[PDB]
């Protein structure tokens with residue numbers, strides 16, 4: 001793939017992929033595994049977010065993509081989505097700022113750049 | 122996409138997609154959401170499988186693909202995987218046979234046929 | 243493929259493919275074979291255009307895509323190009339208006355819709 | 364693209380792309396432009412081969428791919444084709460051996476590795 005690696009739930013600044021994206025690129029992502037967003041036995045999350053028996057605020061404790069400090073939903077993954085801004089791709093477990101210290105585990109994520117922007121001319 | 126729909130957790134025979142696959146095709150799948158594989162408060166499953174605070178045997182209670190009565194791991198998703206046998210793609214919550222009655226909920230799944238088999242000649 | 247067929251050189255209005263494209267879709271095309279853009283034995287064209295021993299004006303006698311009555315270069319083919327406007331894909335041998343009567347032959351063309359527009363959100 | 368560049372018609376050993384393909388990968392290629400396979404005014408060829416008013420033996424003076432010292436037709440291009448052998452992708456103007464000395468020009472070729480072999484399992 002274009003990048004595969006682990007996304008630690010404790011990394012408040014997320015994980016750098018080294019992928020530089022341009023508006024109009026298309027990408028696909030899949031994410032596997034389990035993390036904790038708190039020490040309580042219930043505070044598990046898949047990339048899609050917290051287990052529904054303990055919901056958290058909108059988009060919190062979900063896997064997101066940061067592109068140039070814009071934030072996009074990813075969750076368990078996306079297929080052939082258009083990149084709407086230029087920027088480096090950072091993957092982030094979107095916990096509340098300052099609450100990462102009780103997080104543990106990591107997701108295994110694959111990213112494919114399906115295409116680089118080139119328009120019909 | 123080529124197919125998008127829900128896959129009920131209580132469907133012992135899965136969800137038929139109507140996608141007729143051939144050996145050599147390649148597909149991508151992403152799966153979102155949550156299901157219950159049992160009545161207990163901890164018996165939640167992502168497509169990847171049960172939440173690890175109540176682990177189940179390998180592959181059990183995970184989203185799988187059935188093609189020609191063969192099962193293949195899918196989980197939260199797969200990217201550009203080659204199909205090894207002809208048959209219609211069936212999406213299945215791979216619970217223990219006979220234990221589908223205590224299941225509820227459904228996953229939301231998208232399937233893309235990335236390519237139809239054609240070799241260099 | 244999504245569409246495969248022949249594009250006749252003598253069709254002043256091109257060949258309608260039935261592929262309804264939206265802005266943001268991406269497509270790939272490959273074009274094979276040879277056509278006559280005139281009755282002389284020198285007036286041969288590949289999809290990229292006239293054989294350069296009898297050159298014609300820019301874009302003339304080349305395979306182009308017509309979408310929303312706008313013309314885009316295709317030639318021998320394109321890979322993963324972004325569609326800039328909505329409309330049915332029309333494949334056109336781009337001969338001088340009024341000069342299609344002395345044309346003959348057809349290209350063998352394949353089109354794949356690589357993705358349907360869907361932005362990260 | 365994974366690789367793009369020129370394929371000189373006078374290169375008897377073709378052009379090495381540095382793409383190391385594996386059996387089960389899929390690729391797309393498109394090739395543009397015109398070359399001479401001889402010094403006479405009619406000995407032009409597109410990637411699909413010579414202009415048909417001076418036809419040459421089958422596959423001669425076409426753009427082919429060499430992988431594992433086997434030969435595959437490419438021509439003006441191919442979409443999402445499965446690679447049947449392991450090797451580096453070599454792009455070659457398939458002139459009769461020993462007759463490259465009267466060739467000139469080059470095709471402009473783009474190659475995309477559409478996917479790397481990974482089966483459903």
Ligand SMILES: O=C1C=CC2=C(C1)Oc1cc(O)ccc1[C@@H]2c1ccc(NC(=S)NCCO[C@H]2O[C@H](CO)[C@H](O)[C@H](O)[C@H]2O)cc1C(=O)O
Pocket residue numbers: 400401402406419420423424458459460461462463465
């Ligand atoms: O160093 C050597 C190089 C070549 C050959 C050597 C030694 O020895 C022998 C000994 C033999 O007993 C018989 C043949 C050969 C050699 C050979 C010489 C010419 C041709 N084709 C000829 S003349 N006309 C077809 C139209 O011509 C155009 O198309 C061509 C492609 O079809 C080329 O691109 C050519 O450039 C272009 O003008 C074939 C052969 C062969 O090998 O089959």
Ligand SMILES: O=C1C=CC2=C(C1)Oc1cc(O)ccc1[C@H]2c1ccc(NC(=S)NCCO[C@H]2O[C@H](CO)[C@H](O)[C@H](O)[C@H]2O)cc1C(=O)O
Pocket residue numbers: 279280281285298299302303337338341342344
């Ligand atoms: O019976 C009739 C026969 C011919 C013509 C008739 C009636 O009426 C009109 C009325 C007008 O108002 C203007 C022109 C014509 C007639 C005509 C048509 C074509 C050309 N040549 C041109 S443009 N470029 C030279 C290379 O030509 C090749 O390439 C071309 C693309 O570049 C095309 O594909 C062409 O087909 C192919 O041969 C000249 C005339 C003319 O007579 O000037």
Ligand SMILES: [Ca+2]
Pocket residue numbers: 037038095096099100101102103
């Ligand atoms: Ca936390």
Ligand SMILES: [Ca+2]
Pocket residue numbers: 158159216217220221222223224
């Ligand atoms: Ca159960």
Ligand SMILES: [Ca+2]
Pocket residue numbers: 279280337341342343344345
């Ligand atoms: Ca004409």
Ligand SMILES: [Ca+2]
Pocket residue numbers: 399400401458462463464465466
């Ligand atoms: Ca030659």
